[PDB]
Amino acid sequence: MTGHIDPTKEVFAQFRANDREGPIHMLNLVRLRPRAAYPDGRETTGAEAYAAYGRDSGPVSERLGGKVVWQGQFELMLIGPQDEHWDHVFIAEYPSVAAFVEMIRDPVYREAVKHRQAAVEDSRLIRLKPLKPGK
């Protein structure tokens, strides 16, 4: 897959534009590459690289209010194409758009994400407003 790894500048501007007060839930669908694509040639698995991203970004996220509020192990694409499969599926909550922006501006995060860039073959990051589960 030549898939989607990073957000575009235009769409991130849209993210920041919609700054309504309230938590944001970030649904992540991540397909990891078998071999990590670092610029230096280093040879490691996508999983190992994604782990490093996690290890190094965790504290920044935690400090600014991020928390993983749901996580699941992928078992089956019951409706959808079979070429779609995800290795990590989770929802991260942040208490504000501003918290998320501060995370992605953090110098420590900006280094950690270099690992994500090397790790991810394809992904989705869907921004949602949480609802009371009654439609």
The answer to whether the beta carbons of residues 89 and 28 sit under 8 Å apart is yes
Nearer to Cl ion, 11 or 35 (CB): 11
Nearest to 88 by CA among 54, 132, 38, 62: 54
Nearer to Cl ion, 27 or 37 (CB): 27
In the list a copy of itself, Cl ion, none, the entry touching 75 (Cβ below 5 to 8 angstroms by class) is a copy of itself
Task: Read off the DSSP letter of residue 45.
Answer: B
In the list a copy of itself, Cl ion, none, the entry touching 5 (Cβ below 5 to 8 angstroms by class) is a copy of itself
Q: Of 17-56, which residues contact a copy of itself (CB under 8 A)?
A: 18, 24-27, 51, 54
Task: Read off the DSSP letter of residue 35.
Answer: B
**Distances in whole angstroms, Cα of residue 53 to Cα of each of 29, 80, 124:** 15, 29, 17
Nearest to 103 by CA among 21, 15, 20: 15
Q: Is 92 in the site for Cl ion (CB under 5 A)?
A: yes
CA–CA gap between residue 133 and residue 25 (Å, rounded): 14
In the list Cl ion, a copy of itself, none, the entry touching 79 (Cβ below 5 to 8 angstroms by class) is a copy of itself
Interface residue list for Cl ion (CB under 5 A):
26, 92
Interface residue list for a copy of itself (CB under 8 A):
4-7, 11-12, 14-15, 18, 24-27, 51, 54, 67-82, 84, 86, 89-91, 123-133, 135
